[PDB]
Amino acid sequence: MRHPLVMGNWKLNGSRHMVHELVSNLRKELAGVAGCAVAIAPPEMYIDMAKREAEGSHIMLGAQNVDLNLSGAFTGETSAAMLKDIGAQYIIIGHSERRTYHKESDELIAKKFAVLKEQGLTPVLCIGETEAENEAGKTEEVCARQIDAVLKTQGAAAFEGAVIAYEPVWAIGTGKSATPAQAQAVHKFIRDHIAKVDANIAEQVIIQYGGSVNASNAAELFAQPDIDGALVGGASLKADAFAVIVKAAEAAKQ
Amino acid sequence: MRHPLVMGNWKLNGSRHMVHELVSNLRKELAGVAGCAVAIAPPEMYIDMAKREAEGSHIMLGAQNVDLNLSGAFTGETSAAMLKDIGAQYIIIGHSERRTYHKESDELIAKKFAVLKEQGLTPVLCIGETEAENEAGKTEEVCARQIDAVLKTQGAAAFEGAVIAYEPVWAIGTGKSATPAQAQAVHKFIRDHIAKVDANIAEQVIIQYGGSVNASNAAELFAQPDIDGALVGGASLKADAFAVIVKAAEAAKQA
Ligand SMILES: [Cl-]
């Protein structure tokens, strides 16, 4: 029985005003929630402020990316040691926006995963297939490759305490939609793939859905046995909507 | 005359403890400075804390990079609107570490310059030639090309109130250093290049030296007429050393 995790990826959205309002409203909307863990990833300059504002709540912090070095002559980079130092626990790596827009390779993302692991932070490893890969029936091949970049170079124990987020990139448009059954099939495949190396590790990995989640499909999605929560995008910017998703995850896994 | 600017590029160095200690020590060491402007660029997650620690001093804040979007579905990016909101003013763009390790193009860097000007922020445009380029006699061609990415798309007016930092990249990990005379010749070339388009704008541009600057060598660099300060790396992590540099710039440019 895995404790669910709902994480808000704020993407490139935030301000001093917005952080104060949204974190305060999240605390209020999440009052009484005990059965679903909650994390947020504001833009990096606001992590400190958000952590301090989250004091008194159960909201955990996180970040949207990390680089490979801990310190040194690396102007503009993000250090895992510094993310740990300001209080970010859940660090998104390999998001589709970075694999695409920033050409981040599977191997680079696996290096990120390793640095996070060495610092004692929790990677949120994003994986998923494109429109063409999905059409060609390559969903499993792609997800296995993206996972193997870590599994084959770092061992199954690399996944102890880790999170994977499955992004059905192929379903981004309003023309295509992933059903809970389709999502479940991919999550089961992911878990089964790790289980071939270590069944115990596979059992404890948190596999979040990273496709669009709303109040009308959350119950069904979270009703699936291998779906352990969600990495939420736009809905994370509105406290009421985000809390509905968190409560649905709590209700489903109780 | 041009009022000098000494800016500390902390690079990938910082922690809450380090920020508090360093900013406190900088406040003390720089409290008596009048004739040199000072900025610091901590790692992005520490800008807010550093800005709050600097309140009450003349230390200005800055950042080490920016991306192109103000907001939206751009996981992991840095927004100029957010840098403005948290209090950063001097934004380093095109640093040699980013042109090399992150393959940032002249054109990308010029787009970053434009977004910063749209937000009322001050670009610190880094330019400079590699070991191979220096060996090939292309110092001027390279600097001209990197500057032209902005000048030929946004005009000389884009350089109002802006800063340029010249990095002799050929001096990094080669065990060599540019002499003050060599640095001065490059700075005068950069200024003359902009002057071909607008002499007035060229006279007011702050052109910082971005090679290695140390408490020991700051005076000899700041004695040069077209060197208006420095973008300091390692010495920026020790308040005593950084203050010696600031004071050297103040003394060199003082009435
Ligand atoms: Cl110090």
Residue numbers in the entry:
A (entry chain B): 1 to 254
B (entry chain A): 1 to 255
What's written in the study?
We provide crystallographic evidence that acP can bind to substrate and co-factor binding sites and that acP-dependent acetylation of key lysine residues of the central metabolic enzymes triosephosphate isomerase (TpiA) and glyceraldehyde-3-phosphate dehydrogenase (GapA) could alter their function. We used a high-throughput peptide array technology to determine if acP-dependent acetylation of susceptible lysines could occur in a non-enzymatic manner and x-ray crystallography to both confirm acP-dependent lysine acetylation of specific proteins and to examine the molecular environment of susceptible lysines. Taken together, these crystallographic results confirm the hypothesis that acP can acetylate lysine residues in the absence of an acetyltransferase. Finally, we propose that acP-dependent acetylation can be both non-enzymatic and specific, with specificity determined by the local three-dimensional (3D) environment that surrounds the substrate lysine residue, as well as by its solvent accessibility and pKa.
Since the in vitro and in vivo linear (1D) sequences did not match, we examined the 3D acP-binding environment in native, folded proteins, asking whether positively charged lysine or arginine residues were located in the vicinity of acP binding sites and/or acP-sensitive lysine residues. AcP is bound in the active site. The acP ligand is surrounded by the Fo-Fc omit map that was contoured at the 3 sigma level. Side-chain and main-chain interactions with acP are shown as gray dashed lines. The S. cerevisiae structure has the substrate 1,3-dihydroxyacetone phosphate (13P) bound in its active site. K11 is shown in each structure. An arrow indicates the movement for loop closure between open (cyan) and closed (gray) forms of the protein. The affinity requirement appears to be satisfied by the formation of salt bridges between the negatively charged phosphoryl group of acP and positively charged residues of the protein to be acetylated. An alternative or additional contribution is from hydrogen bonds between the phosphoryl group and hydrogen bond donors such as hydroxyl and/or amide functional groups that surround the lysine. Like K1065 of the RNAP β subunit, other lysines located in active sites of proteins that bind a phosphorylated substrate could be acetylated by acP.
